[PDB]
Design a protein around this ligand. Structure first.
Ligand SMILES: *[C@@H]1O[C@H](CO[C@@H]2O[C@@H](C)[C@@H](O)[C@@H](O)[C@@H]2O)[C@@H](O[C@@H]2O[C@H](CO)[C@@H](O[C@@H]3O[C@H](CO)[C@@H](O)[C@H](O)[C@@H]3O)[C@H](O)[C@H]2NC(C)=O)[C@H](O)[C@H]1NC(C)=O
Ligand SMILES: *[C@@H]1O[C@H](CO)[C@@H](O[C@@H]2O[C@H](CO)[C@@H](O[C@@H]3O[C@H](CO)[C@@H](O)[C@H](O)[C@@H]3O)[C@H](O)[C@H]2NC(C)=O)[C@H](O)[C@H]1NC(C)=O
Ligand SMILES: *[C@@H]1O[C@H](CO)[C@@H](O[C@@H]2O[C@H](CO)[C@@H](O)[C@H](O)[C@H]2NC(C)=O)[C@H](O)[C@H]1NC(C)=O
Ligand SMILES: *[C@@H]1O[C@H](CO)[C@@H](O)[C@H](O)[C@H]1NC(C)=O
Ligand SMILES: *[C@@H]1O[C@H](CO)[C@@H](O)[C@H](O)[C@H]1NC(C)=O
Ligand SMILES: *[C@@H]1O[C@H](CO)[C@@H](O)[C@H](O)[C@H]1NC(C)=O
Ligand SMILES: [Zn+2]
Lengths: 195, 596
């Protein structure tokens, strides 16, 4: 009946850091999927198991809009079965991922001359991420066999590194706002329809 | 958790922190070099200091992982490069002593001034003052004055500093387990643990000396022909059998014989190819020059310049109030930011340099995917060689005709080619004995094979014997004539210009072979040959990841530096030189000096 709050997710003033990726549950609303275009410099729209052509002909039990910022190179890692720092440690898509990955260049917004250090990513982790896992822990990563004592030092690194986006970065290092639409299918009334 | 894994994880931290801090330093250096302000000075120093302090911190951090415990050679390469960066090998006093010496020698070189003997009020710096004399003056005494005054006033200042510089630099090298500082410099070519591609530091001297032997016949005939032409212009100053006076070689040291072309051009009637007028005729600008340069690398399958290149590069002089350091440099700031700083004029020379500097960019973009510590040329000579071969193809009449800068009604006779090769040999061939002998002297000085009381004795013994160049004024050991050159007094290895010269023709010969080029090598343009660009790219993307021997083989099919392509490039001149030196003495006598 009411419009799904995609403008909140896509047009958010600040996206979440990819290590702390924002998840927005989309439910009980009409999902207008042709509104997903912000006239962005490098738009990306790839779906899996679902058809982006006429995406508004299907009901879904729940839609999970996951939003975060990575750099241009790492957008390829937002895809099923991909490997890399973002997929392993920040945002892993399942092999059977049912949904779409929307990404676009946000150098206008998320880059600063002095360097935008708002956006972080997890550089180290004892293990990779389960699909849709989120690790916001700032516990010092233990690379050596000595203790870390909660402070960064030799073989003890803070697991989060900042992108430091600057507008003069190359396209592969420029910030890219990424929205992952995760379409859920259950035994439930499937209350996310809408042409 | 092993210790290679620790190093792997440590390099992961360093790569991400270094790229950010290096970018800030590079951009701060960029903003100074395009907007010369006392602010942009300061921000450059602050970013440079924060980058050096990070590197010193990471160098000490990297050393806590011993090398014998890493099997991964890629990790060991980055770890070794970070540990070899370790400044804490000398005592903080001797490190401070050395840095003070390096700054003072650098300051003496860049601020050293000589004043006219008749009127001591007017004083000249090396650049542009003394360099203007050395490159353009035809007057013997004025050239003798500027050559001697630079070495007598500025060189003598550097003698005590260079003596202490050698001691501390050797002490540094001996503490890094190198034989001496010359051995330390030769470590740039060292390869270990890669069977079939290993290369020792000592092998560099042998390869340089072995290849210089094959250079000698070409150089002696070039030296003999240049001497014969200079002797005609200076009958009372040049012996037909003696060495060339050091002040009559085209620059302050005879590093290049380029400015001898006017006095040594084979056929001065036939005009040289200069498309500068054609560029102005067609209303070319700096944007057109780099677009044409970008078009050249696209033709060989290399990518176009990034969108940030055109936006963020400086391709023209800002002029007006905004001053800039106009030295043509290609900038790899990291994180996808590749720029060219160049105060480009609408001239053929700047047209070729744009191809040259963009050639560095193509090298930078190709290994941008490599780890930060491996983002460099395969060795010190690779990057310069890559840039040189672009200007080689871009300057050919075939390339200049294909882009509408040389009209088809121009035809190339063998006399203009001999003219062109002679000009090339003056710069390219003439520098090799200068480069080898200078670096040989520095190698022997670091090795201790030259005592302090025979530095200038041996420096000029080797100048006469190897370069065929004689000092015009006797020099005692109060002089330091090598330090009168930038690289010696500014602590830069010099054999890179010898190896690069042999690399570039190895590269060009291979790419032209890939381009299916028929004819003499010097006429070759690699344009529109994706096979040539692919063969070049298979090395460019390597960066420092693979041994330079392998990166060389990925282009030329040979694991070692080879002089044959250099001689192949100059063979039409070499045969012409031997014919032209039919009734001329080839070789030189070291005993002859213009001061009798
Ligand atoms: C320790 O490392 C520093 C930094 O070098 C930088 O970082 C390394 C990890 C590599 O990635 C290098 O490719 C990279 O440049 C070394 O300082 C560097 O020295 C070189 C030569 O001595 C400098 O080259 C020249 O510097 C002048 C400065 O005005 C430029 O104008 C020239 O165009 C040319 O580039 C280089 O600038 C300098 N680095 C910086 C940031 O200034 C240092 O030599 C090294 N020490 C040891 C013992 O290895
Ligand atoms: C986020 O905010 C942006 C504004 O910055 C919204 O942009 C809107 O994007 C849609 C794309 O679906 C545009 O609709 C299209 O307009 C073109 C003509 O411009 C038309 O031919 C198409 O058929 C389509 O209707 C829309 O014009 C554009 N602007 C506005 C004011 O709506 C974007 O919709 C916002 N995102 C979300 C998820 O709400
Ligand atoms: C040496 O280490 C590098 C990594 O430091 C290895 O290459 C990586 O292998 C992993 C395994 O899938 C990939 O995820 C990476 O993309 C590879 N490259 C890099 C740059 O990390 C390499 O295989 C190792 N070699 C040996 C002989 O141990
Ligand atoms: C150069 O730097 C000054 C500050 O020192 C700044 O005001 C000016 O805008 C800069 N010029 C350019 C062209 O960026
Ligand atoms: C040049 O850049 C554009 C980006 O707009 C790209 O599409 C193209 O493939 C690049 N290379 C060539 C040869 O056009
Ligand atoms: C060029 O070739 C002509 C014959 O075609 C010959 O007479 C002349 O000597 C040659 N000149 C040079 C410099 O080789
Ligand atoms: Zn160059």
């Amino acid at each position: 009946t009411n419009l799904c709050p995609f403008d909140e997710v896509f047009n958010a003033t600040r996206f979440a850091s990819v290590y702390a990726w924002n998840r927005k549950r989309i439910s009980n609303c009409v999902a207008d999927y042709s509104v997903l275009y912000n006239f962005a410099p490098f738009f990306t729209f790839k779906c899996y198991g679902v058809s982006p052509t006429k995406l508004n002909d299907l009901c879904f039990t729940n839609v999970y809009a996951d939003s975060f910022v990575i750099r241009g190179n790492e957008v390829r890692q937002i895809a099923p079965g991909q490997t890399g720092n973002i997929a392993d440690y920040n945002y892993k898509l399942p092999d059977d991922f049912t949904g779409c990955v929307i990404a676009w260049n946000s150098n206008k917004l998320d880059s600063k001359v002095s360097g935008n250090y708002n956006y972080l990513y997890r550089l180290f982790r004892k293990s990779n991420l389960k699909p849709f896992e989120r690790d916001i822990s700032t516990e010092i990563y233990q690379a050596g066999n000595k203790p870390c004592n909660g402070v960064a030092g030799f073989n003890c690194y803070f697991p989060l590194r900042s992108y430091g986006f600057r507008p003069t970065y190359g396209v592969g290092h420029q910030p890219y706002r990424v929205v992952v639409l995760s379409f859920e299918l259950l035994h439930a009334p499937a209350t996310v329809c809408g042409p | 958790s092993t210790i290679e894994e620790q190093a792997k994880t440590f390099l992961d931290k360093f790569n991400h922190e270094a790229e950010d801090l290096f970018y800030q330093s590079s951009l701060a250096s960029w903003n100074y070099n395009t907007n010369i302000t006392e602010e942009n000075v300061q921000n450059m120093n602050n970013a440079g200091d924060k980058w050096s302090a990070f590197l010193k911190e990471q160098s000490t951090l990297a050393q806590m992982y011993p090398l014998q415990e890493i099997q991964n050679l890629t990790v060991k390469l980055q770890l070794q490069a970070l540990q070899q960066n370790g400044s804490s090998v000398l005592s903080e006093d001797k490190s401070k002593r050395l840095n003070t010496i390096l700054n003072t020698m650098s300051t003496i070189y860049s601020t050293g001034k000589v004043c006219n003997p008749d009127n001591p009020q007017e004083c000249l710096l090396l650049e542009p003052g003394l360099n203007e004399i050395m490159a353009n003056s035809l007057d013997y005494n004025e050239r003798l004055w500027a050559w001697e005054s630079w070495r007598s006033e500025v060189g003598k200042q550097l003698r005590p500093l260079y003596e202490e510089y050698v001691v501390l630099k050797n002490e540094m090298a001996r503490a890094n387990h190198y034989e001496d500082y010359g051995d330390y410099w030769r470590g740039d070519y060292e390869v270990n643990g890669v069977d079939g591609y290993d290369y020792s530091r000592g092998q560099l001297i042998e390869d340089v000396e072995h290849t210089f032997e094959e250079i000698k016949p070409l150089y002696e005939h070039l030296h003999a022909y240049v001497r014969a032409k200079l002797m005609n212009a200076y009958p009372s100053y040049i012996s037909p059998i003696g060495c060339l006076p050091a002040h009559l070689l085209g620059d302050m040291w005879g590093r290049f014989w380029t400015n001898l072309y006017s006095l040594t051009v084979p056929f001065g009637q036939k005009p040289n190819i200069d498309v500068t007028d054609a560029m102005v005729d067609q209303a070319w600008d700096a944007q057109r020059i780099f677009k044409e340069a970008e078009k050249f690398f696209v033709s060989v399958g290399l990518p176009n310049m990034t969108q940030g290149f055109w936006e963020n590069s400086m391709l023209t002089d800002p002029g007006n109030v905004q001053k800039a350091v106009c030295h043509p440099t290609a900038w790899d700031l990291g994180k996808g930011d590749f720029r060219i700083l160049m105060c480009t004029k609408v001239t053929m020379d700047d047209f070729l340099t744009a191809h040259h500097e963009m050639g560095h960019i193509q090298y930078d973009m190709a290994y941008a995917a490599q780890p930060f510590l491996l983002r460099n040329g395969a060795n010190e000579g690779f990057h310069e060689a890559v840039g040189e071969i672009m200007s080689l193809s871009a300057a050919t009449p075939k390339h200049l005709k294909s882009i509408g800068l040389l009209s088809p009604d121009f035809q190339e006779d063998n006399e203009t080619e001999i003219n062109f090769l002679l000009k090339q040999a003056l710069t390219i061939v003439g520098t090799l004995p200068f480069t080898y002998m200078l670096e040989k002297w520095r190698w022997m000085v670091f090795k201790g094979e030259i005592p302090k009381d025979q530095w200038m004795k041996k420096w000029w013994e080797m100048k006469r014997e190897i370069v065929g160049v004689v000092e015009p004024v006797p020099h005692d050991e109060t002089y330091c004539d090598p330090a009168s050159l930038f690289h010696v007094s500014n602590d830069y290895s010099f054999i890179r210009y010898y190896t690069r010269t042999l690399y570039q023709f190895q590269f060009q010969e291979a790419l032209c072979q890939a381009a299916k080029h028929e004819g003499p090598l010097h006429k070759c343009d690699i344009s529109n040959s994706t096979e040539a660009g692919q063969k070049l790219f298979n090395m460019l993307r390597l960066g420092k990841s693979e041994p330079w021997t392998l990166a060389l083989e990925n282009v030329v099919g040979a694991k070692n530096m080879n002089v044959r392509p250099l001689l192949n490039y100059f063979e039409p001149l070499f045969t012409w030189l031997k014919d032209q030196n039919k009734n001329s003495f080839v070789g030189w006598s070291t005993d002859w000096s213009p001061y009798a």
